[PDB]
Amino acid sequence: KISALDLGELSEPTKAYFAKCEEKLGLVPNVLKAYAFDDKKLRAFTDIYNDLMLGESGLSKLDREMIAVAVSSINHCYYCLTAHGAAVRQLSGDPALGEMLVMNFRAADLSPRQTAMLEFAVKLTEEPAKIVEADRAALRKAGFSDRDIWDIASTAAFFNMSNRVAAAIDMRPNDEYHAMAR
């Protein structure tokens, strides 16, 4: 079961893409399978995911994965802590960093720059109503540009969406994730 919801054969272009996934990764990420009932939806998801997590940014790819895990920790999202926790381990080379981010980032002995980024993602996840100029000013003082700030917010905001889709439908992450990068 990739989820608790019941939704056709895959379209030719999704089979093409999934082939690519299986060639590059060992596997087709289950989130893509969840979306595959509707190619418009699949394509719009992959378009945003890739721009946000892989696009050009002052944040590294690992920065963004660390934001994704921090937010997914607060929300207790099993799919995302699994998939993106594997990504932190893999991108960092540090199996322990992935566990700490999954459990409590305050445990991690992060740099000031990384702390500031994650503390903002925390407030944005927990109490969006309360974000004020002082919260932006804290990121600037940490050395982030305003476009960096856009990218931190966008990433944190995105995972607030991803967590809730996954929770809503009980989406299951690939079993291969668990053993990777340990």
Nearer to a second copy, 22 or 51 (CB): 51
Q: Which of 147, 151, 180, 168 is nearest to 77 (CA)?
A: 168
Nearer to a second copy, 22 or 95 (CB): 95
Q: Which one among 4, 16, 19, 27 touches a second copy, defined by CB under 8 A? A: 4
The two most distant CA atoms of the chain are separated, in Å, by: 52
Phi/psi region, residue 102 (left: phi>0; alpha: psi -120 to 50; beta: rest), is: alpha
Q: Cβ 113 to a second copy, closest distance in Å? A: 16
70 CB-contact burial (10 Å; exposed 0-12 / middle 13-18 / buried 19+): buried
Two tokens, residue 81: 């802590």
Phi/psi region, residue 54 (left: phi>0; alpha: psi -120 to 50; beta: rest), is: alpha
Of 112-131, binders to a second copy (CB under 8 A) are 120, 124-125, 128-131
Nearer to a second copy, 9 or 129 (CB): 129
Residue 38, CA distances (Å) to 32, 84, 88, 150 in order: 10, 24, 30, 30
Q: Cβ 49 to a second copy, closest distance in Å? A: 9
Q: Which one among 15, 61, 141, 178 touches a second copy, defined by CB under 8 A? A: 178
Contact range with a second copy by CB under 8 A, out of 12-20, 24-32, 58-66, 94-102: 94-102
Contacts to a second copy by CB under 8 A: 4-7, 37, 40-41, 43-45, 47-48, 51, 55, 73, 75-78, 81-82, 95-96, 99-100, 102-104, 106-107, 120, 124-125, 128-133, 135-136, 146-147, 149-150, 152-154, 156-158, 160-165, 167-170, 172, 175, 178-179, 182
